[PDB]
Amino acid sequence: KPRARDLGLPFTGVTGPYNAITDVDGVGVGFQTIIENEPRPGRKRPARSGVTAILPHMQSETPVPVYAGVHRFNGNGEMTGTHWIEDGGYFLGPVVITNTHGIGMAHHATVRWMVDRYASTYQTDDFLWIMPVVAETYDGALNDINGFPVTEADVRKALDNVASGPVQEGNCGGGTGMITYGFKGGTGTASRVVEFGGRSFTIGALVQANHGQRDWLTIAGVPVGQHMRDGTPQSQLSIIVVLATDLPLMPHQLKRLARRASIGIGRNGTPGGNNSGDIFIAFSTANQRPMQHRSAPFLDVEMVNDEPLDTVYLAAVDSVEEAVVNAMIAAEDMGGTPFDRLLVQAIDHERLRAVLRQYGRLA
Amino acid sequence: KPRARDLGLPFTGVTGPYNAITDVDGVGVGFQTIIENEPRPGRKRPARSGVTAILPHMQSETPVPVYAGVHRFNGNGEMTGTHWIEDGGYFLGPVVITNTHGIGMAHHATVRWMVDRYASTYQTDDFLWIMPVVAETYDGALNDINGFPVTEADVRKALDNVASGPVQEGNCGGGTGMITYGFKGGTGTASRVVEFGGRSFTIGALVQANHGQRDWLTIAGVPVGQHMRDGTPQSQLSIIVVLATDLPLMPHQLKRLARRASIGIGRNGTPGGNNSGDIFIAFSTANQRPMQHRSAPFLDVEMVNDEPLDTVYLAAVDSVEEAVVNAMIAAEDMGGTPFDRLLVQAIDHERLRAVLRQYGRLA
Amino acid sequence: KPRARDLGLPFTGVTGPYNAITDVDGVGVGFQTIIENEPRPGRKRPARSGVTAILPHMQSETPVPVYAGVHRFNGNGEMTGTHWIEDGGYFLGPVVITNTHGIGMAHHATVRWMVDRYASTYQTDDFLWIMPVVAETYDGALNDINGFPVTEADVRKALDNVASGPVQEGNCGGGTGMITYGFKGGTGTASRVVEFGGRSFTIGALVQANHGQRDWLTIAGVPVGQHMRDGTPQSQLSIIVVLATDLPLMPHQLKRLARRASIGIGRNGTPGGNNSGDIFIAFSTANQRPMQHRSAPFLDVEMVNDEPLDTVYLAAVDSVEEAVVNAMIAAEDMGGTPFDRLLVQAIDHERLRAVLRQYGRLA
Amino acid sequence: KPRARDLGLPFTGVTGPYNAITDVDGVGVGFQTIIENEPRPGRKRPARSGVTAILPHMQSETPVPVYAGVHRFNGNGEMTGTHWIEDGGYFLGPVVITNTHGIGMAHHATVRWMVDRYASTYQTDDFLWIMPVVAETYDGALNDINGFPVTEADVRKALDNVASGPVQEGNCGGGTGMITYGFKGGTGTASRVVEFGGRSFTIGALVQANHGQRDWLTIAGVPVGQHMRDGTPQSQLSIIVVLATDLPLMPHQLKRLARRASIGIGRNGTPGGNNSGDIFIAFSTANQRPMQHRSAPFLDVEMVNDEPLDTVYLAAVDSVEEAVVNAMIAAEDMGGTPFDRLLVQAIDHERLRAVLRQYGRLA
């Protein structure tokens, strides 16, 4: 499986080792993918969905707070756990992404998993509560979303599968049944390394791309969507962005970094559709500390000066754009069975390359 | 059961009917209450929890958008469904309140119930998604919160039990296991009728009171907590506010109304604790309209002028204070079994009356 | 001049030495007070107004960033400089408070004063811009506000007069012509010392009180406004809160602290009027650092754990309530001339004491 | 003067008659431009600055509230008047744009101008206050910003000059001394006409472009900044966006519209620089009503459904992009005198055409 850079698309700077969000130290990604092409008993439509889990500091025996910031570009979607991100500045545990009507079971399963996995924290006499970050995009065109196919066991499998190294893209995890710009969408990831004050830090992005319309699609500045008009879902009948970094940032700086994903999604053409739940979260793995109930009264934290941040912002925007394009390149056709209303095609690599060549952007 | 006014407490203005949130026409409240005093098999602590459901336009055959506004006073808690309240301006379906780790099952159950109840809307070819408003307070001192006692059936029972009329208070629904100001807490409700542009409207409040410390408790402006010092949970070892009105208000005005609940909770003494998840939602039942996919492109709406709103703001504040006190008066002692760490007592009515009398505030 | 504690009002905890915002080391307060009782040439109404200036790190030869947070409880007023407080986390220079239509001249004068006072910073080749924090309340009932009485020289005088030590209250600075709860209002201040993690800190408040209606007035929990009904402004025909602390807080924590001023203003009875511009700013004097253009790329900062903050929140609430009541106790009758529409009286001390005594609250 | 479309750039959709913000009926624009090439007495650098004024409902004898919404993308700049836009939902009077240190005099001059212009509203016995919307970008590289060249008379001249019709672009009004993408910047405008529900509406934008670095510049998706590398300000040694529409939108909807300008400024390449004060305001001219003190208690308003808004969001993004490019095309070289540090050149039209032609984007 070539990724976008392999096809000659003219991407943007130096990446971490795997060109993925796992290039940020300690962050692991796990997936559970459900691809069925016949309905379950009592249903009329097949289940194509899944769960994505991103866990920071995956080696720690205790949950480690990660400072974080959210940006709600267009709130037509769900992302739980953000009230204490906004006021307390951090979250604990994994980011879990699934389909819109699997939020509940994913939230329930994640709390249960945290109580088991971090038993020495939560199965004690301390009064602690868990508020996980669970988010979604809507796969009802290709998935039997009102059949609630994702179970507790499916979400635990994603959490138990978290790992470092290369990350699968395309039709996997929460991205399985997604559609972006009229083509097959799904999971995408990328990373960038930047130098800041004599040290090297990584910015990694993971997206669940389910947004945009064909006409808007722009790849490398070329209006590809004006040239590749066939097979759109419309003719036959949301985006979650997670940014991770090891740069030492505080909450107020991370809310600014998350806001940069607005430009990041704009790069491939969308003006931000009304029905698109476009919600971005950014977290840092720097400044490790105990949970509130075990911390000393004063904490010493490192924080970056703001002056040099333009290169970090550029890296974040570029990583989001490459993560979206990687999802489209990695995706495969889906649908077209007797139980489907549509056939969603993955963007054709040779036709893409040809259009970019005509506009002098095929590297 | 006498309520606060029945004991001579010096409350504030004219109430609707039932002096409850059901005084706002069409708003129904349902409860599922779980009170056990012996552990379930494999658990060590008893289950004392439940679910509260508040459903606007409870007669409608289709979900009716209700404009709304949220105020996160201190975000150490969860309230789902707020991203589209912020950007879209409204929510659909019920407000469901339970315990912290019951969010996920309550969310899952609510989406499933909505798909069944509003089958003519959701079991169609339309691409529609549901993002319910599910909130919580933490009952881990009296409840086996990591045993996940609330099931899907429990939440469906609360939803199917919604009704107009008098509302049960104290140890019921989501407030079953809650503690407030070191005394037994739980569910409380109150309402006010106001005249605006001649016209008569109601403001009703429902609270799940689990906040505050004994030392802070102020009732009718009297420092009761300084006089009633025994039995605190501390010596032995959050608040969700929902405001409903039929006044015709738009989202930006409803956000201000919800922010008035900050002063409302301040009335009984709290300075707003760090660990308290204090999140308030206000919604109007005016301006009924179809869902987005069935609406005409232009809607005609009525909105109040802002000049005469002080009387509405005062009624909101007063109703929140009365609802909190009503919860304490309705509450009953809980705990003290061989499986408990604490015995939480309900505030004693005669002792309270005596303290108020000493400061000239017993009416 | 007795302050509220001197009259036997039952205030709250241990104050710093001056019981004022200048108890926070290095914070200076300066005033310019204009009290005229005949109209200036071409005007019909007299000028009663002024400027209040609060300067953190008043010894420093260069401007020192102070982390800060704002809460807009009801935005019917102006407070400039908040965009970079929200995103950047801090502000530089003084907080300047005046009347509503004097914002512009105060802003202009403050920039000019900073360019002259910090000449080694601003009269260089560096590209630097200044965005001062200038706020207001509306003194149109007692002041010729459309006569623009405050000049550049008036604001420079306040800035040049900043000093530590005891702070004047009542009819002075920006508070000169203000009215609160139908009585004469104005400037008030108070402070609290708290122990946090084996260290001592101070929380100081300064308020410009111009809010509330007589009927709502509550002092020490007693409904004083129901007993002292005469001479209201109505019968004859906003609040800025600044909190300063030396506790090491980051911006996300300071926004929470500023939000606690909502309860602080609720303590004296207001439900938060529609026309009241109720805007609060909290800043810390800890974590001194250079300006952005002179900072190293990485900074080391100290930050408190959030667990023990309840005593800090309680001190902040109590300090706001005391600063408001101090403002009413220090104020003097104003108006009643042939050019006035009103005569605004200060609350009478003996009548106040008598009402408190009847409810058992006169210490 | 050819504008961007006249040079063959491949712009986007149908414009209104002037392709400017004055295509929204009743919106006037007025400018005061100060271009001096020798220092004023006692100064060392020349003054090149000015004022831009945008007045909705310019014919009205009384101020007419216009619902509006703001998006602070990166708050390193000032825009006054936003607290009541956020909570009250509207503003009155003009949007005035100038240089960073001219805020104060522009604010003062606008309040004074409104008192005179709307004398039947403000020179009465009513208690009314004015909180104008005054914004800025920083022209310190080309202008003697610490000389405070803009006077009260300069701002009154811009206000008195508001007019419909064609709008001047480039080195005029507040944009006079601005620099964008290392080329001369300034004022730019554009409009789009869209059909919504059988009715025709216009979206217009006006920008004061002072943002970006040369290397990021992208025009029509082409990386022009990589090809036109000479004369950058760096080698020699912020953006305010105003969107106006006649679509009937409420405040919560206008906040989303103003958020779309983030994608609009990302079209030309910036990732959003840390030092860039990028603040956007959107307002609607629909739903005319009286001021709060003259309104009936209930108002009837028209509001759009959200479903069809994607075409409006696209029009908004495209108009911001065209306005920024129009500002660069209209700009003229500035500086390079014995008193300057730099010579800022306007982008060369022929060179730009040549780079676009090479990538197949010259229409």
PDB file of C-alpha atoms in Angstrom, chain C residues 217-354:
ATOM      1  CA  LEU C 217     -29.943  44.629  48.490  1.00  0.00           C
ATOM      2  CA  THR C 218     -28.781  41.972  50.968  1.00  0.00           C
ATOM      3  CA  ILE C 219     -25.999  42.648  53.514  1.00  0.00           C
ATOM      4  CA  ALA C 220     -24.726  39.848  55.737  1.00  0.00           C
ATOM      5  CA  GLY C 221     -27.636  37.716  54.457  1.00  0.00           C
ATOM      6  CA  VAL C 222     -30.214  40.266  55.670  1.00  0.00           C
ATOM      7  CA  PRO C 223     -32.696  41.731  53.161  1.00  0.00           C
ATOM      8  CA  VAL C 224     -31.753  45.320  53.994  1.00  0.00           C
ATOM      9  CA  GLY C 225     -33.266  46.688  50.798  1.00  0.00           C
ATOM     10  CA  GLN C 226     -36.767  45.602  51.976  1.00  0.00           C
ATOM     11  CA  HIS C 227     -36.256  47.782  55.091  1.00  0.00           C
ATOM     12  CA  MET C 228     -34.444  50.828  53.616  1.00  0.00           C
ATOM     13  CA  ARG C 229     -36.756  51.894  50.811  1.00  0.00           C
ATOM     14  CA  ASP C 230     -36.376  55.667  50.663  1.00  0.00           C
ATOM     15  CA  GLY C 231     -34.642  58.021  48.250  1.00  0.00           C
ATOM     16  CA  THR C 232     -34.157  55.559  45.395  1.00  0.00           C
ATOM     17  CA  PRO C 233     -33.129  57.009  42.044  1.00  0.00           C
ATOM     18  CA  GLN C 234     -36.298  55.535  40.507  1.00  0.00           C
ATOM     19  CA  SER C 235     -38.645  57.384  42.897  1.00  0.00           C
ATOM     20  CA  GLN C 236     -37.025  60.721  41.994  1.00  0.00           C
ATOM     21  CA  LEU C 237     -37.279  60.272  38.196  1.00  0.00           C
ATOM     22  CA  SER C 238     -22.537  47.525  35.990  1.00  0.00           C
ATOM     23  CA  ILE C 239     -19.642  46.313  38.137  1.00  0.00           C
ATOM     24  CA  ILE C 240     -16.013  45.818  37.187  1.00  0.00           C
ATOM     25  CA  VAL C 241     -14.198  43.383  39.530  1.00  0.00           C
ATOM     26  CA  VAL C 242     -10.411  43.139  39.538  1.00  0.00           C
ATOM     27  CA  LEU C 243      -8.878  40.201  41.506  1.00  0.00           C
ATOM     28  CA  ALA C 244      -5.071  40.069  42.038  1.00  0.00           C
ATOM     29  CA  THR C 245      -3.110  37.299  43.729  1.00  0.00           C
ATOM     30  CA  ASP C 246       0.463  36.169  44.174  1.00  0.00           C
ATOM     31  CA  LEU C 247      -0.604  32.467  43.950  1.00  0.00           C
ATOM     32  CA  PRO C 248       1.107  30.826  40.943  1.00  0.00           C
ATOM     33  CA  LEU C 249      -1.793  30.236  38.574  1.00  0.00           C
ATOM     34  CA  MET C 250      -1.888  29.632  34.807  1.00  0.00           C
ATOM     35  CA  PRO C 251      -4.472  31.261  32.510  1.00  0.00           C
ATOM     36  CA  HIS C 252      -6.971  28.355  32.508  1.00  0.00           C
ATOM     37  CA  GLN C 253      -6.963  28.487  36.314  1.00  0.00           C
ATOM     38  CA  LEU C 254      -7.317  32.266  36.403  1.00  0.00           C
ATOM     39  CA  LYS C 255     -10.406  32.196  34.187  1.00  0.00           C
ATOM     40  CA  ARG C 256     -11.950  29.917  36.828  1.00  0.00           C
ATOM     41  CA  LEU C 257     -10.970  32.332  39.574  1.00  0.00           C
ATOM     42  CA  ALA C 258     -12.494  35.304  37.741  1.00  0.00           C
ATOM     43  CA  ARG C 259     -15.730  33.276  37.283  1.00  0.00           C
ATOM     44  CA  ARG C 260     -16.024  33.073  41.088  1.00  0.00           C
ATOM     45  CA  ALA C 261     -16.738  36.829  41.108  1.00  0.00           C
ATOM     46  CA  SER C 262     -20.220  35.885  39.776  1.00  0.00           C
ATOM     47  CA  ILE C 263     -21.049  34.406  43.178  1.00  0.00           C
ATOM     48  CA  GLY C 264     -19.187  37.307  44.812  1.00  0.00           C
ATOM     49  CA  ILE C 265     -21.577  39.864  43.275  1.00  0.00           C
ATOM     50  CA  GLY C 266     -24.578  37.622  43.956  1.00  0.00           C
ATOM     51  CA  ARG C 267     -23.766  37.862  47.707  1.00  0.00           C
ATOM     52  CA  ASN C 268     -25.313  41.340  47.977  1.00  0.00           C
ATOM     53  CA  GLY C 269     -28.516  40.392  46.156  1.00  0.00           C
ATOM     54  CA  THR C 270     -28.309  41.110  42.457  1.00  0.00           C
ATOM     55  CA  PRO C 271     -29.482  38.368  40.053  1.00  0.00           C
ATOM     56  CA  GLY C 272     -27.342  40.163  37.403  1.00  0.00           C
ATOM     57  CA  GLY C 273     -29.341  42.864  35.653  1.00  0.00           C
ATOM     58  CA  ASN C 274     -29.662  42.975  31.854  1.00  0.00           C
ATOM     59  CA  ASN C 275     -28.241  46.478  31.626  1.00  0.00           C
ATOM     60  CA  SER C 276     -25.357  45.701  34.004  1.00  0.00           C
ATOM     61  CA  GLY C 277     -21.932  45.308  32.347  1.00  0.00           C
ATOM     62  CA  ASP C 278     -20.514  42.762  34.816  1.00  0.00           C
ATOM     63  CA  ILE C 279     -17.011  41.888  33.653  1.00  0.00           C
ATOM     64  CA  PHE C 280     -14.323  40.385  35.896  1.00  0.00           C
ATOM     65  CA  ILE C 281     -10.559  40.049  35.506  1.00  0.00           C
ATOM     66  CA  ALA C 282      -8.205  38.017  37.697  1.00  0.00           C
ATOM     67  CA  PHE C 283      -4.416  38.168  37.436  1.00  0.00           C
ATOM     68  CA  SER C 284      -1.421  36.680  39.234  1.00  0.00           C
ATOM     69  CA  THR C 285       1.828  38.447  40.011  1.00  0.00           C
ATOM     70  CA  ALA C 286       3.758  35.135  40.194  1.00  0.00           C
ATOM     71  CA  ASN C 287       5.954  33.637  37.443  1.00  0.00           C
ATOM     72  CA  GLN C 288       7.647  36.863  36.442  1.00  0.00           C
ATOM     73  CA  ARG C 289       9.188  36.573  32.995  1.00  0.00           C
ATOM     74  CA  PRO C 290      10.445  38.736  30.151  1.00  0.00           C
ATOM     75  CA  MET C 291       8.221  39.976  27.331  1.00  0.00           C
ATOM     76  CA  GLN C 292       7.838  37.618  24.363  1.00  0.00           C
ATOM     77  CA  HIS C 293      10.540  39.223  22.247  1.00  0.00           C
ATOM     78  CA  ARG C 294      13.152  38.937  25.028  1.00  0.00           C
ATOM     79  CA  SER C 295      12.278  35.487  26.345  1.00  0.00           C
ATOM     80  CA  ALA C 296      14.262  32.277  25.914  1.00  0.00           C
ATOM     81  CA  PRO C 297      12.383  29.609  23.934  1.00  0.00           C
ATOM     82  CA  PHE C 298      11.567  27.598  27.062  1.00  0.00           C
ATOM     83  CA  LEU C 299      10.283  28.952  30.383  1.00  0.00           C
ATOM     84  CA  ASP C 300      10.059  27.212  33.746  1.00  0.00           C
ATOM     85  CA  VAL C 301       6.809  28.069  35.567  1.00  0.00           C
ATOM     86  CA  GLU C 302       5.281  27.066  38.904  1.00  0.00           C
ATOM     87  CA  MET C 303       1.584  26.134  38.958  1.00  0.00           C
ATOM     88  CA  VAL C 304      -0.675  25.082  41.825  1.00  0.00           C
ATOM     89  CA  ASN C 305      -2.382  21.710  41.951  1.00  0.00           C
ATOM     90  CA  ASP C 306      -6.181  22.237  41.762  1.00  0.00           C
ATOM     91  CA  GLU C 307      -7.197  20.039  44.748  1.00  0.00           C
ATOM     92  CA  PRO C 308      -6.693  22.601  47.518  1.00  0.00           C
ATOM     93  CA  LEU C 309      -8.252  25.578  45.690  1.00  0.00           C
ATOM     94  CA  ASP C 310     -11.595  25.653  47.558  1.00  0.00           C
ATOM     95  CA  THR C 311     -10.142  27.913  50.222  1.00  0.00           C
ATOM     96  CA  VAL C 312      -8.834  30.235  47.505  1.00  0.00           C
ATOM     97  CA  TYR C 313     -12.212  30.348  45.790  1.00  0.00           C
ATOM     98  CA  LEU C 314     -13.904  31.102  49.137  1.00  0.00           C
ATOM     99  CA  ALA C 315     -11.441  33.912  49.815  1.00  0.00           C
ATOM    100  CA  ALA C 316     -12.042  35.426  46.357  1.00  0.00           C
ATOM    101  CA  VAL C 317     -15.846  35.373  46.849  1.00  0.00           C
ATOM    102  CA  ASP C 318     -15.578  36.879  50.326  1.00  0.00           C
ATOM    103  CA  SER C 319     -13.183  39.595  49.148  1.00  0.00           C
ATOM    104  CA  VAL C 320     -15.560  40.661  46.364  1.00  0.00           C
ATOM    105  CA  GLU C 321     -18.521  40.899  48.749  1.00  0.00           C
ATOM    106  CA  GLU C 322     -16.467  42.933  51.257  1.00  0.00           C
ATOM    107  CA  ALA C 323     -15.135  45.289  48.548  1.00  0.00           C
ATOM    108  CA  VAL C 324     -18.696  46.026  47.373  1.00  0.00           C
ATOM    109  CA  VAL C 325     -19.967  46.768  50.919  1.00  0.00           C
ATOM    110  CA  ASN C 326     -16.796  48.812  51.614  1.00  0.00           C
ATOM    111  CA  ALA C 327     -17.620  50.951  48.584  1.00  0.00           C
ATOM    112  CA  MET C 328     -21.131  51.717  49.959  1.00  0.00           C
ATOM    113  CA  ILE C 329     -19.757  52.461  53.456  1.00  0.00           C
ATOM    114  CA  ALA C 330     -17.090  54.865  52.108  1.00  0.00           C
ATOM    115  CA  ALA C 331     -19.365  56.683  49.675  1.00  0.00           C
ATOM    116  CA  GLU C 332     -20.784  60.117  50.320  1.00  0.00           C
ATOM    117  CA  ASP C 333     -24.011  61.786  49.190  1.00  0.00           C
ATOM    118  CA  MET C 334     -23.821  63.292  45.719  1.00  0.00           C
ATOM    119  CA  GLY C 335     -26.036  65.452  43.483  1.00  0.00           C
ATOM    120  CA  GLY C 336     -29.072  67.450  44.672  1.00  0.00           C
ATOM    121  CA  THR C 337     -27.877  70.681  43.013  1.00  0.00           C
ATOM    122  CA  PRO C 338     -30.063  72.846  40.750  1.00  0.00           C
ATOM    123  CA  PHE C 339     -28.355  71.100  37.802  1.00  0.00           C
ATOM    124  CA  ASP C 340     -29.142  67.535  38.933  1.00  0.00           C
ATOM    125  CA  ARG C 341     -32.130  65.255  38.350  1.00  0.00           C
ATOM    126  CA  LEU C 342     -31.314  63.255  41.480  1.00  0.00           C
ATOM    127  CA  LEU C 343     -29.728  63.387  44.901  1.00  0.00           C
ATOM    128  CA  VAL C 344     -28.081  60.009  45.538  1.00  0.00           C
ATOM    129  CA  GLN C 345     -27.576  59.287  49.244  1.00  0.00           C
ATOM    130  CA  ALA C 346     -24.902  57.059  50.797  1.00  0.00           C
ATOM    131  CA  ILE C 347     -26.395  54.274  52.955  1.00  0.00           C
ATOM    132  CA  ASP C 348     -26.823  55.504  56.529  1.00  0.00           C
ATOM    133  CA  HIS C 349     -24.563  53.651  58.947  1.00  0.00           C
ATOM    134  CA  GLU C 350     -26.782  53.788  61.996  1.00  0.00           C
ATOM    135  CA  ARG C 351     -29.906  52.642  60.149  1.00  0.00           C
ATOM    136  CA  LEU C 352     -27.877  49.811  58.624  1.00  0.00           C
ATOM    137  CA  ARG C 353     -26.560  48.716  62.035  1.00  0.00           C
ATOM    138  CA  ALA C 354     -30.088  48.802  63.463  1.00  0.00           C
TER     139      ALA C 354
END
